[PDB]
Design a protein around this ligand. Sequence first.
Ligand SMILES: NC(=O)c1ccc[n+]([C@@H]2O[C@H](COP(=O)([O-])OP(=O)(O)OC[C@H]3O[C@@H](n4cnc5c(N)ncnc54)[C@H](O)[C@@H]3O)[C@@H](O)[C@H]2O)c1
Ligand SMILES: NC(=O)c1ccc[n+]([C@@H]2O[C@H](COP(=O)([O-])OP(=O)(O)OC[C@H]3O[C@@H](n4cnc5c(N)ncnc54)[C@H](O)[C@@H]3O)[C@@H](O)[C@H]2O)c1
Lengths: 329, 329
Amino acid sequence: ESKRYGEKLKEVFLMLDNNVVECIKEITESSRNGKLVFFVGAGVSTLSDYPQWWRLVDKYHEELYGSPKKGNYSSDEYLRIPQIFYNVKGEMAFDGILKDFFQVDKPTNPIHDKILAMNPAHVITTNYDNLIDTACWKRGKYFSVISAEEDVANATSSRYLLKVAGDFRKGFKGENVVLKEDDYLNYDQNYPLISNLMKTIIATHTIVFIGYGLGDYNINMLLNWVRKLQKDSFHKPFFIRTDPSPIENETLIYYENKGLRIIDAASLIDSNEYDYLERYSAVMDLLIESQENKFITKDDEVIDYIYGKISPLFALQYIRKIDLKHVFE
Amino acid sequence: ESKRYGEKLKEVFLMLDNNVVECIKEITESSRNGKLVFFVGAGVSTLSDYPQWWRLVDKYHEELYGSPKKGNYSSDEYLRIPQIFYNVKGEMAFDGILKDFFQVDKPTNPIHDKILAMNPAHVITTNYDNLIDTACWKRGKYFSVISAEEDVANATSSRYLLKVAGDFRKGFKGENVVLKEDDYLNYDQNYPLISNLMKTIIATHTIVFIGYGLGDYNINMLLNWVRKLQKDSFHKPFFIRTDPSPIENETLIYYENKGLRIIDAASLIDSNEYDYLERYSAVMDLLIESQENKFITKDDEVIDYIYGKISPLFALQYIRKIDLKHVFE
Ligand SMILES: NC(=O)c1ccc[n+]([C@@H]2O[C@H](COP(=O)([O-])OP(=O)(O)OC[C@H]3O[C@@H](n4cnc5c(N)ncnc54)[C@H](O)[C@@H]3O)[C@@H](O)[C@H]2O)c1
Ligand SMILES: NC(=O)c1ccc[n+]([C@@H]2O[C@H](COP(=O)([O-])OP(=O)(O)OC[C@H]3O[C@@H](n4cnc5c(N)ncnc54)[C@H](O)[C@@H]3O)[C@@H](O)[C@H]2O)c1
């Protein structure tokens, strides 16, 4: 643990392919320059035992028909069942179940802290829990929260916490979040400001995609928007994938040509089929410890961390030694 | 069968709900006025043993990932797996699978003839097989086939056969149909005239959906387009549903509020789990035998059928006896 984990991370750093090393090098540089923006989704919140969306679709399904579905719900059944419930049963009944499920208090997993350990310029989450807001407040990093159209102009600070999928701050109702099918069908007409505010950060910042699946609605919509741009014209987003099985090569080639630079979590380490907290932690600790220069051991590498900090100080003819402990950390 | 079927259909009609009776009467009136259009899907081709699309999505999966998938493909897999196989293995292999799977010759089931016996003014189909074209040709009905943009202007007849999903007439290649995921995204740009033609036919005619699942992709786009329209302004399409299990009440209310009048084939008879032909023929025979006046069993209907034919002739001073045999057929 104390020694095992420290040795394991440094050992895994030496076996990584050049692609993962380049991805980590770019992520660390973006974080140091101050242009790193995380994109948290469902998966960084379920580590805090937050309910998954299918557990509410099942409740809607068994309150409409009478029995849970015999299988896993598809992408259409995630938006169509709650819409059938809203149309048939009504709106107050649709909000009673939301109040029952989402009126819970849960802790903040360590990942929520690690995301704040890299100093992200912004944070773009597509979930409605206040776990990330609580973590940011407790760690002392003030972030202006933007969960409504009226919040875009009234931004007190410069760092954002854009919740592009609504929020339950104003109350536990379905008019503040995007859950049904018609909510997605009218997202660009009901949220015209948070769409621009999200598409601008993606184009003028480094983006990471922790906590997301590789076939989500949001990821595919973002890739559809990205394909409408020109030749390169922007930085390809990084995608931390933490699924149990290793990613197939065909599906990796298919997605790496659409913009993603995938960093699979179940390839640097071997873990159990349910140890998700130890798959997020591998990538996050790899990035954080790459920031701290722990994974630096070579003769030519010390002539880069030394030249890369002394070379700018060449126009000056004689710099003081009292502040020379500032050009280095 | 031979003689019991005539009594069984009459009993079913006598034991029908009033909504289905009204739907059948309106359908018969539309057929008699020449304003009936049939929307045929990929459920009248499987009666001819035509290869279902999930077999191609299974061959693509087997050739990509080496082994078949576990379970049943969702909506996204129906459009993404073919797209991944395209982007990875090339258009040549994509079309090689298409030619090997779709270059077959199947007969025309009795439903293709019951469809034509109702005398439709148009036929809109999302399948690519030429089964409906063969059925039209082998009965003396001339329909102008329309499966590409260049065919819209070069039409010669007034009765269209609008294949709104393409056709393999000009070669068994994937560029002549809509099968992938990017084909569906760029459909309004690649088929701007066929969409307008289909929308105009839907607006100015009576539509019956036969062969489509209720949660189909195509149906849920027409249902979204038909909501952007104003108040009533048109006629709600008829949907002939022939699934093995009866439709639930909530899902019936959900789709009847979206502008659909549903005729459930699994609620008018008692068929087996795989007796799809006996359910198609149970709803396509009620309409045809209602046209033939096999259900008139009251004096208020015999003094009305005669009156609807004879009343317009009251203007004429005297009609010949060889025209009374023309007024009635
Ligand atoms: N889809 C259904 O109807 C259904 C039915 C029964 C059970 N489940 C279970 O719900 C879980 C999520 O299913 P999904 O369809 O959203 O796949 P998903 O990959 O789209 O889930 C999103 C991401 O959540 C992340 N994550 C972090 N901790 C997790 C945890 N304990 N469990 C799951 N994900 C975690 C993962 O990185 C995952 O990629 C799965 O464990 C699944 O077995 C789903
Ligand atoms: N639903 C899936 O994703 C899936 C996946 C793998 C295999 N399958 C198999 O394919 C069959 C149909 O799958 P689908 O994707 O077309 O969904 P679906 O059942 O909704 O098919 C659409 C329509 O085909 C009509 N039809 C007429 N004859 C039919 C026949 N012999 N078999 C099936 N439908 C007939 C049905 O009335 C239906 O409305 C299923 O019975 C199953 O054995 C389905």
